[PDB]
Amino acid sequence: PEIITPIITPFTKDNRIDKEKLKIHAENLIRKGIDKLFVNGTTGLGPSLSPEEKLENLKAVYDVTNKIIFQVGGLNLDDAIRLAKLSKDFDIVGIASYAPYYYPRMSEKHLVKYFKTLCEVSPHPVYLYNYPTATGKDIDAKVAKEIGCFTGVKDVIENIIHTLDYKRLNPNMLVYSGSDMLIATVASTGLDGNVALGSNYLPEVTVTIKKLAMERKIDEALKLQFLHDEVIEASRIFGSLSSNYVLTKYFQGYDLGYPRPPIFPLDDEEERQLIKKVEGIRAKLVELKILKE
Amino acid sequence: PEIITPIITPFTKDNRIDKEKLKIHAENLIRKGIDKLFVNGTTGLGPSLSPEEKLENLKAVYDVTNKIIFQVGGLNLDDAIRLAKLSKDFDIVGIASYAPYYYPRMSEKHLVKYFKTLCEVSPHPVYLYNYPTATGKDIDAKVAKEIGCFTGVKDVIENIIHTLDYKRLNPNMLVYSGSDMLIATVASTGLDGNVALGSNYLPEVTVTIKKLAMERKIDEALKLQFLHDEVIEASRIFGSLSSNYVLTKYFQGYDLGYPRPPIFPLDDEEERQLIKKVEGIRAKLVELKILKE
Amino acid sequence: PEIITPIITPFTKDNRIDKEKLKIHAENLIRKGIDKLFVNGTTGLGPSLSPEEKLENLKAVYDVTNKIIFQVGGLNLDDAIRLAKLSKDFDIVGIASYAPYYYPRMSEKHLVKYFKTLCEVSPHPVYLYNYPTATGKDIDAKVAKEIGCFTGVKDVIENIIHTLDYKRLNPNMLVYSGSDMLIATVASTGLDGNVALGSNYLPEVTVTIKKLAMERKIDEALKLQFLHDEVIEASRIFGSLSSNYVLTKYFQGYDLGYPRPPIFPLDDEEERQLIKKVEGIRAKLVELKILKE
Amino acid sequence: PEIITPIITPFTKDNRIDKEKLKIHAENLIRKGIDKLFVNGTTGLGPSLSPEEKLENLKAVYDVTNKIIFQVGGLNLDDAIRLAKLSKDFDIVGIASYAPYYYPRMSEKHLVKYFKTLCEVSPHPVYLYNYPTATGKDIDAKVAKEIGCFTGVKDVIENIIHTLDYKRLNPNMLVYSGSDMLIATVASTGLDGNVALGSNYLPEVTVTIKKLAMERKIDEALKLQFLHDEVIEASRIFGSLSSNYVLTKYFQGYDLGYPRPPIFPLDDEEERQLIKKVEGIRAKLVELKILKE
């Protein structure tokens, strides 16, 4: 099983992608044992990025590692098809696309066509980015098999039956979970790991949970999972997307700049009060020697 | 009360806004009694348009009428701010914005700041575009009061209490409904009108339904309202965002081009069947003399 | 249009139906202008009542008025069929049944059979008691027409499109709304009125809203609707089912005893604090002379 | 971990509990490795049973095994209290109760008092039966701690995080899952077992799936788990509450009679098709020698 990082997108104060901070972050992640980097996902504000910025993220992370999965979806097919085709000159793992978002109650025929269209033009493996809440629709294991070109899938959902059903109807298919709270459970049940936002700021923890569960040390893996759960919950107090920046700076040293409004940054006060609820968690992670003081 | 068309965006076979076909559509809608025009809404594929293109829609429709509500929402705040500002040189009704979409569980603080921001920069009345299903968050009567700079609201929701509650807490706010199926109901219960997707292809009807109920002939209004309900339902067969293009050509007699993929046009086969579904309905409206022969 | 009362079931301290208090309440209701009394509904804890107690309520209210609709549904068909048949000796409006509750995802065939079975044996008109939330399933206007024996329907839902669709596919059918917050809107849109829990403790208000909306005085009817809304909301603070007893005693004089645990009564403190939030409302109802001091 | 059967209730053609057929079913389940028996659950049509009949189920199954969890829930508190008390003369595992069903938006106060009440009277360990979909309210990990007298919980829910969270906040509580499709997953992630509807007709499988995963052969466990998933799905064709009767007779070779209408039996025609759906599955289990010829 793997741990993939939907890598944050650091923005400058003038709202420009910080290519240089993004690189320092990708290095720390690969350094600390992350398997691949999932680019332009929700955690990096993919839908907030222009086709040229979605490509920036690729080009800046490709200076660091070629263990990349490249998300290209939007509400303009010609834009996505271009991004799919330009990735040909990048030796990477694959490209990804979430279902066309916003517009509710799209037909199963129109969604299957969107994905098949991207397979017809892709120069790399195609991963499905199934996120029913964010997109408004669910490409479940049945429609995934109907489309029939998905090398893998990130299933962002709380129902683990839904996720396992991909591996049931699509046996050859890689099946990752988007939930950070199921890292220990996904590792132990025979799926191919997790795509973990929380690994942006605690890659140490996400990897160690994976290892403990791999070692059939489940009682221990749950000890550490539940701790990571408490951080996922603290970041939720002030908007997790905006708190993901604060928590990477607190746990990993370097800062990642700013998010893109309306994903507003935390102010100095929200930052203090958030640090105040993970101090205790950071300490026990140090006492367990999972983190360096 | 008023009938407002969330006006379709015609696209060229090259995925380009057809400014001339849109002008034709605006003229016709106004000639047939549409009060105002809602530009860059869901029906018009706003979330699929760029800021440059959202602006193109404004300038193109402003060439024919200035009864315009200019939607300017997106996931980049600076873009919405610039659009809002540039409207200053236009004599229009107001600007509007849906809540930032996609991202789940945004903080009420972040949400309120997004809207209050657009108010601080707006050179025109600010209307709330409330669409919980598509955007993934609800700006209810309470949060609207909290923001407290909305001249009006378009509430796309099944719960009509929700709609009435904007008038309960904001006694001076215009409250419209996003339902085509409540044109008669809204009029009769003292709400201010309907932003009707279906007024794109049957303005005569949407305006007549309102008329009858306001003449206190509620039984005649339901009789015609129920006829319009069948056109709404039939359009939903092949995805109503795409079927509006086929229905406007059928009923209003001019071409509106294509939608923007992943909002796929209907093919010859699907278009053929949809017209069969509404053949009879056209006949009942031509008998009742709501439509020209 | 009508106002029907899903009449409370007063219980004694030893948890026995208080036939005598129930009668005093039914009289006040008919006295104050309520059209019919809906017996064994949610508001009277129907599902908490044994087949013999469901019959008690009938026999005790039939000493007062024959304007009764008699709810008989449960999870035992033989029990319901008996109650349907014993009502033959009562000259009343009809019998009612909510869809079989609790068990999720029952088949459309098994639900249509439950209702048709009760029509085959009923000696009175059969009303549908559609409450999707309480029962877990929705007998929408299409399945109502499929069953094809419903004289009417109480539609407990916030979506008024759903409710109107009964009158669209079932034109002969009586269509009442279960929502107390749509009394003014239902009266004005051409449906046959409301079944109002709130008329247990403010029948004066529910009737006056109906009358104002009947008089096409909608701006005035909304004034009074929104007030009733504030009481529906106050009763919600402490469990509305349990607060319905306190609010009938506060506004109508007589007390109705106790509810049936786990619908626990309010304690003296919750009763005081509830009275504290409707004092102001009771006053303005007096100043508008809708209520006698 | 453990496998627990929510044991079916056999009914006579006269809508009467078949105490002798139930005894047969209990014996067989125990002989085939079922740890305990959950009496008067959803699968057993508890909410359709009277207190007298819920008690009949206890005495009948207690004639064969005392590994019983005695469900005693209802909408009359006194009834549940009396059932709880009468269990004192039995050497059973515990008593259980779902949250009071039907009535929406019950107060957390009223809910907690309902459960704490059953604890104050219980002569046995109290297990929480958590089933948000059917009952209409969720007793999550936090409210369980707040009540704080539950030896264990059966969590019928798709969100497996929800389930893990009982163990997070209540480190000493037994946490079971109500999913047949997570027998392998639960075992492997350190949770305490599954209350499986499907163990009624395929105990051999449900116990084997658990076995394999606990022998660390997770790939073999999924292989058999996915086979059981097809039996769950097929049963759902004609309503799985009724299909269990047909599947137990098919697989275990004895008759369990009828369910209780409105939980309608399958007819000759529906029963015929369901067996066709599971013909092949029986073959794969007989080859793999999980079933006798």
Coordinates of C-alpha atoms in Angstrom, one line a residue, chain A:
Chain A
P1 CA 0.0 0.0 0.0
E2 CA 1.0 3.6 -0.7
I3 CA 0.6 7.1 0.8
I4 CA 0.0 9.8 -1.8
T5 CA 0.0 13.5 -1.1
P6 CA -2.5 15.9 -2.7
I7 CA 0.1 18.5 -2.6
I8 CA -0.7 22.0 -1.4
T9 CA -0.4 24.9 -3.9
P10 CA 1.6 27.7 -2.2
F11 CA 0.5 31.2 -3.4
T12 CA 2.4 34.4 -3.1
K13 CA 1.0 37.6 -1.5
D14 CA 0.1 38.8 -5.0
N15 CA -1.7 35.5 -5.7
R16 CA 0.8 33.9 -8.0
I17 CA 2.0 30.3 -7.7
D18 CA 5.1 30.1 -5.6
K19 CA 7.1 27.7 -7.7
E20 CA 10.0 27.8 -5.3
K21 CA 8.1 27.1 -2.1
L22 CA 6.2 24.3 -3.9
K23 CA 9.5 22.6 -4.7
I24 CA 10.8 22.8 -1.1
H25 CA 7.6 21.1 -0.1
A26 CA 7.7 18.4 -2.7
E27 CA 11.2 17.5 -1.6
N28 CA 10.3 17.2 2.1
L29 CA 7.4 15.0 1.1
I30 CA 9.4 12.6 -1.1
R31 CA 12.2 12.8 1.4
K32 CA 10.0 11.7 4.3
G33 CA 8.8 8.7 2.4
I34 CA 5.6 9.7 0.4
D35 CA 5.1 7.4 -2.5
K36 CA 3.6 9.8 -5.1
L37 CA 2.4 13.4 -5.3
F38 CA -1.2 14.0 -6.5
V39 CA -1.2 17.4 -8.2
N40 CA -4.1 19.8 -8.6
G41 CA -6.4 18.0 -6.2
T42 CA -8.9 19.6 -3.8
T43 CA -6.1 20.1 -1.3
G44 CA -4.1 22.2 -3.8
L45 CA -7.2 24.2 -4.9
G46 CA -7.3 22.5 -8.3
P47 CA -10.7 23.9 -9.4
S48 CA -9.4 27.3 -8.4
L49 CA -6.5 27.0 -10.9
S50 CA -6.4 28.1 -14.5
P51 CA -5.3 25.6 -17.2
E52 CA -2.0 27.4 -17.3
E53 CA -1.6 27.2 -13.5
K54 CA -2.6 23.5 -13.4
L55 CA 0.4 23.1 -15.7
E56 CA 2.7 25.3 -13.6
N57 CA 2.2 22.9 -10.7
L58 CA 3.1 20.0 -12.9
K59 CA 6.3 21.7 -14.3
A60 CA 7.4 22.9 -10.8
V61 CA 6.9 19.5 -9.1
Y62 CA 8.5 17.7 -12.1
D63 CA 11.7 19.5 -11.3
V64 CA 11.6 17.4 -8.1
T65 CA 10.1 14.0 -8.7
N66 CA 8.4 12.1 -11.6
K67 CA 6.2 10.2 -9.1
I68 CA 3.3 12.5 -10.1
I69 CA -0.4 12.0 -10.9
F70 CA -1.6 15.0 -12.8
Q71 CA -5.2 16.2 -12.3
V72 CA -6.6 18.0 -15.3
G73 CA -10.3 18.3 -14.9
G74 CA -12.5 21.3 -15.3
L75 CA -15.7 22.6 -16.8
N76 CA -14.0 23.1 -20.3
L77 CA -13.3 19.8 -22.1
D78 CA -11.0 21.5 -24.7
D79 CA -8.9 22.8 -21.7
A80 CA -8.7 19.3 -20.1
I81 CA -7.9 17.6 -23.4
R82 CA -5.0 20.0 -23.9
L83 CA -3.6 19.3 -20.4
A84 CA -4.0 15.6 -21.0
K85 CA -2.0 15.9 -24.3
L86 CA 0.8 18.2 -23.0
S87 CA 1.6 15.7 -20.2
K88 CA 3.0 13.4 -22.9
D89 CA 6.4 15.0 -22.6
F90 CA 6.3 14.2 -18.8
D91 CA 7.4 10.7 -17.7
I92 CA 4.9 10.5 -14.8
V93 CA 2.5 8.0 -13.3
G94 CA -0.7 9.2 -14.9
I95 CA -3.3 11.9 -15.2
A96 CA -6.5 12.3 -13.2
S97 CA -9.9 14.0 -13.4
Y98 CA -12.7 14.5 -11.0
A99 CA -16.2 14.3 -12.5
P100 CA -17.5 17.7 -13.9
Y101 CA -18.5 19.6 -10.8
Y102 CA -21.2 22.1 -9.8
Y103 CA -23.9 21.2 -12.4
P104 CA -26.3 18.8 -10.5
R105 CA -27.9 15.7 -11.9
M106 CA -25.8 15.2 -15.1
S107 CA -26.7 12.1 -17.1
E108 CA -24.7 8.9 -16.8
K109 CA -24.2 9.0 -20.5
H110 CA -22.8 12.5 -20.4
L111 CA -20.4 11.7 -17.5
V112 CA -19.2 8.4 -19.1
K113 CA -18.5 10.4 -22.3
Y114 CA -16.4 13.0 -20.4
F115 CA -14.1 10.4 -19.0
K116 CA -13.9 8.2 -22.1
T117 CA -13.0 11.4 -24.1
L118 CA -10.0 11.9 -21.8
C119 CA -8.9 8.3 -22.2
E120 CA -9.1 8.6 -26.0
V121 CA -6.5 11.4 -25.8
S122 CA -4.4 10.6 -22.7
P123 CA -0.7 9.8 -23.1
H124 CA -0.5 8.3 -19.6
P125 CA -2.6 6.1 -17.3
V126 CA -6.0 7.6 -16.3
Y127 CA -7.0 7.7 -12.7
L128 CA -10.5 8.5 -11.6
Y129 CA -10.9 11.2 -8.9
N130 CA -14.3 10.3 -7.4
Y131 CA -15.4 12.9 -4.9
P132 CA -19.2 12.8 -4.7
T133 CA -19.6 15.7 -2.3
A134 CA -17.4 18.2 -4.1
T135 CA -18.6 17.3 -7.6
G136 CA -22.3 16.5 -7.0
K137 CA -22.2 13.1 -8.6
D138 CA -20.6 9.7 -7.9
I139 CA -18.7 7.5 -10.5
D140 CA -19.3 4.3 -8.5
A141 CA -17.6 1.0 -9.3
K142 CA -20.3 0.1 -11.8
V143 CA -19.8 3.3 -13.9
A144 CA -16.1 3.0 -13.4
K145 CA -16.2 -0.4 -15.1
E146 CA -18.6 1.0 -17.8
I147 CA -16.1 3.7 -18.7
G148 CA -13.4 1.0 -18.6
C149 CA -10.1 2.8 -18.8
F150 CA -9.2 3.7 -15.2
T151 CA -5.8 2.5 -14.0
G152 CA -6.9 3.5 -10.5
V153 CA -9.1 5.7 -8.4
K154 CA -9.1 8.0 -5.4
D155 CA -12.4 7.5 -3.6
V156 CA -13.1 10.5 -1.3
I157 CA -15.9 9.1 0.8
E158 CA -16.7 7.9 4.3
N159 CA -18.4 4.7 3.1
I160 CA -15.6 2.0 2.8
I161 CA -18.1 -0.4 1.2
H162 CA -18.3 2.0 -1.8
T163 CA -14.5 2.0 -2.0
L164 CA -14.0 -1.8 -1.8
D165 CA -16.6 -2.3 -4.5
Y166 CA -14.1 -0.8 -7.0
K167 CA -11.7 -3.7 -6.3
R168 CA -14.6 -6.1 -6.5
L169 CA -15.8 -5.2 -10.1
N170 CA -12.4 -3.8 -11.2
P171 CA -9.9 -6.4 -9.9
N172 CA -7.0 -5.1 -11.9
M173 CA -7.7 -1.5 -10.7
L174 CA -5.7 0.3 -8.1
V175 CA -8.0 1.5 -5.3
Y176 CA -6.9 4.3 -3.0
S177 CA -9.0 6.0 -0.3
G178 CA -9.3 9.8 0.0
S179 CA -10.1 9.7 3.7
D180 CA -7.3 10.4 6.1
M181 CA -9.2 8.7 9.0
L182 CA -9.1 5.3 7.2
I183 CA -5.4 5.0 6.7
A184 CA -5.0 2.2 9.2
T185 CA -8.2 0.5 8.0
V186 CA -7.4 0.7 4.3
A187 CA -3.9 -0.7 4.7
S188 CA -5.2 -3.7 6.7
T189 CA -8.1 -4.5 4.4
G190 CA -6.2 -5.1 1.1
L191 CA -6.7 -1.8 -0.8
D192 CA -3.7 0.1 -2.3
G193 CA -3.5 2.8 0.3
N194 CA -4.6 6.4 0.9
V195 CA -4.4 9.8 -0.7
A196 CA -3.8 11.9 2.4
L197 CA -4.2 15.6 2.7
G198 CA -2.8 15.2 6.3
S199 CA 0.4 13.9 4.8
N200 CA 1.1 17.5 3.7
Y201 CA 1.8 18.5 7.3
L202 CA 2.4 15.1 9.0
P203 CA 3.9 12.8 6.4
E204 CA 5.8 11.1 9.3
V205 CA 2.5 10.1 10.8
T206 CA 0.7 8.9 7.6
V207 CA 3.7 6.7 6.7
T208 CA 4.1 5.2 10.2
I209 CA 0.4 4.3 10.3
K210 CA 0.7 2.6 7.0
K211 CA 3.8 0.7 8.2
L212 CA 2.2 -0.4 11.5
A213 CA -0.9 -1.6 9.7
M214 CA 1.3 -3.3 7.1
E215 CA 3.0 -5.1 10.0
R216 CA -0.4 -6.4 11.2
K217 CA 0.1 -4.2 14.3
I218 CA -3.4 -2.9 14.2
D219 CA -3.8 -2.0 17.9
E220 CA -0.7 0.2 17.5
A221 CA -1.8 1.6 14.2
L222 CA -5.1 2.7 15.7
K223 CA -3.3 4.5 18.5
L224 CA -1.6 6.7 15.9
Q225 CA -4.6 6.9 13.6
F226 CA -6.8 8.3 16.3
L227 CA -4.1 10.9 17.0
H228 CA -4.0 12.0 13.4
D229 CA -7.8 12.1 13.6
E230 CA -7.6 14.7 16.3
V231 CA -5.5 17.0 14.1
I232 CA -7.8 16.5 11.1
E233 CA -10.5 17.8 13.5
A234 CA -8.5 20.8 14.8
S235 CA -7.8 22.0 11.3
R236 CA -11.6 21.7 10.7
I237 CA -12.3 24.5 13.2
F238 CA -11.0 27.3 11.0
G239 CA -11.5 25.8 7.5
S240 CA -9.2 22.8 6.9
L241 CA -8.1 24.0 3.4
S242 CA -6.7 27.2 5.0
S243 CA -5.5 25.4 8.1
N244 CA -3.4 23.0 6.0
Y245 CA -1.0 25.8 5.4
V246 CA -0.6 26.7 9.1
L247 CA -0.1 23.0 10.0
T248 CA 2.6 22.3 7.4
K249 CA 4.5 25.3 8.7
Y250 CA 4.1 24.2 12.3
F251 CA 5.1 20.6 11.8
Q252 CA 7.5 20.8 8.9
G253 CA 9.3 24.1 9.4
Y254 CA 8.9 25.9 6.0
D255 CA 5.9 28.0 5.2
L256 CA 3.8 27.6 2.1
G257 CA 2.6 31.2 1.7
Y258 CA -1.1 31.8 1.2
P259 CA -4.2 30.2 -0.1
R260 CA -6.4 31.6 -2.9
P261 CA -9.4 33.6 -1.7
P262 CA -12.3 32.9 -1.1
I263 CA -10.2 30.2 0.6
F264 CA -8.9 33.0 2.9
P265 CA -5.8 32.5 5.0
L266 CA -5.9 32.3 8.8
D267 CA -5.2 35.5 10.7
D268 CA -2.5 35.5 13.3
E269 CA -5.1 34.9 16.0
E270 CA -6.7 31.8 14.3
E271 CA -3.1 30.6 13.7
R272 CA -2.3 30.9 17.4
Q273 CA -5.5 29.3 18.6
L274 CA -5.0 26.4 16.2
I275 CA -1.4 25.8 17.3
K276 CA -2.8 25.8 20.8
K277 CA -4.9 22.7 20.1
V278 CA -2.1 20.7 18.5
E279 CA 0.7 21.5 20.9
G280 CA -0.3 18.5 23.0
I281 CA -0.6 16.4 19.9
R282 CA 2.9 17.5 18.7
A283 CA 4.3 16.6 22.1
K284 CA 3.0 13.0 22.2
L285 CA 4.2 12.5 18.6
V286 CA 7.6 13.6 19.9
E287 CA 7.4 11.3 23.0
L288 CA 6.6 8.4 20.6
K289 CA 9.7 9.6 18.7
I290 CA 7.7 9.7 15.4
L291 CA 8.6 13.4 15.2
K292 CA 12.0 15.1 15.7
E293 CA 11.9 17.9 18.4

